[PDB]
Symmetry: D2
Subunit: 124 residues, 4 copies
Amino acid sequence: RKCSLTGKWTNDLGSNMTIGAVNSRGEFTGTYITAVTATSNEIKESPLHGTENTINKRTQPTFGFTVNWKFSESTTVFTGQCFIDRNGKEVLKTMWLLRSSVNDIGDDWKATRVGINIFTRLRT
Amino acid sequence: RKCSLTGKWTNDLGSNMTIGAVNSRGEFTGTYITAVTATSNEIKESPLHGTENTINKRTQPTFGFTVNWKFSESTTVFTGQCFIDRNGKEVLKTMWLLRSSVNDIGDDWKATRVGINIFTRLRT
Amino acid sequence: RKCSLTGKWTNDLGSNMTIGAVNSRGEFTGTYITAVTATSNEIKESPLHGTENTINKRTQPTFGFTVNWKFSESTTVFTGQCFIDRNGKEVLKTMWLLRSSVNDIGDDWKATRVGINIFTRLRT
Amino acid sequence: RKCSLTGKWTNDLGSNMTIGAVNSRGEFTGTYITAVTATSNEIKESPLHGTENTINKRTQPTFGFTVNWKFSESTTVFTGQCFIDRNGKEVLKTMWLLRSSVNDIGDDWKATRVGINIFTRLRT
């Protein structure tokens, strides 16, 4: 059996996400819920759109998703791999790119930040 | 007066992509065409899915998308901004993360590459 | 009350490093010890050279350094900040770029990997 | 004959650098001169410390260097490869990490930006 994207996840920074069902083509949607980035009020929710690589029907697939922020002009992309570890726990190890909006093409060079995130299943 | 993602673009390496109509939620799909990476043959086509940010309806929006490679177990994600350049040309400036599949979670650390890509309109 | 780089540290993967005294221009040298990457054997040691930023004499300075791999044609660069964590422990948080050698300039696009590393004091 | 680091270089953004002689060990120093980043007055100069990988005495070596900014609390690291192309011109293709200084360990996630730079010899 394989590492499944569908469901509820949580990270190290305290953000959560829900991913709906993965279609035949390898497609999925969900929502990204966060508490840190720049501002919000309290808790904010944004949609995510992604894909799971289905080649060789691997048990521990790679994937990618885009987060369309609703409270900002930015976009964030995540890519990683759905692993199985801890004693048999599912884990997502990801790396991301955060693109800020700049006003002029000449500041383009300073628009992209990078980092990681690790996700584990939310007690449920 | 409005950098649009819909269309045919080509890059700095020979790869091309075509993007469909963007819908009201800022969602789009498209196709990615290349021969790079490591696949000889002639040309391979893979699907892509992403979003364009609509907050504040900027004329030079940020966006993101994932390429679901059909001839590989990898995933590539792209993020950037659609700019109107000094000469009136539309230019996509992006950065990408290319995720390779590993067999052991232990090898995760070396699974991520990063680079840039510059796209220009081809549908002249 | 002052995160210092001088010392012995270990990371999240088993690698260790020792850094010498930092001089008045913020310059330092040291050694990097590991068995990862892809080199079996037991343990290999490579030299490192870098700087610590002294502008404003912050207590949690940023720094950078390069590892000159002695058993490979590659180069790795690290950058981060030396923090004093909530519990009083010193912590190095860094990101790295690992550059592999290519034969043709044409293959440049795929030569760069990126990741993270967390260091903790070992010289207890 | 090989691609040599020693000398004067210029980039795409309009910054310049001078690299002194490379010792036996593969070590070098130089200065980084820039006009864009955040502020300065007019033209600012900062020192750089790096290394050239000498394994297999390659003709087109990889290298890494750290830039110790003098007008800011940040640090930038560059890594890349010294190529030969254009009709036989020397070029440096680089990728970099820019670390900003943050006040608290909890904002660490947003401290690192990434990008590229291409350098060519300054008419001399």
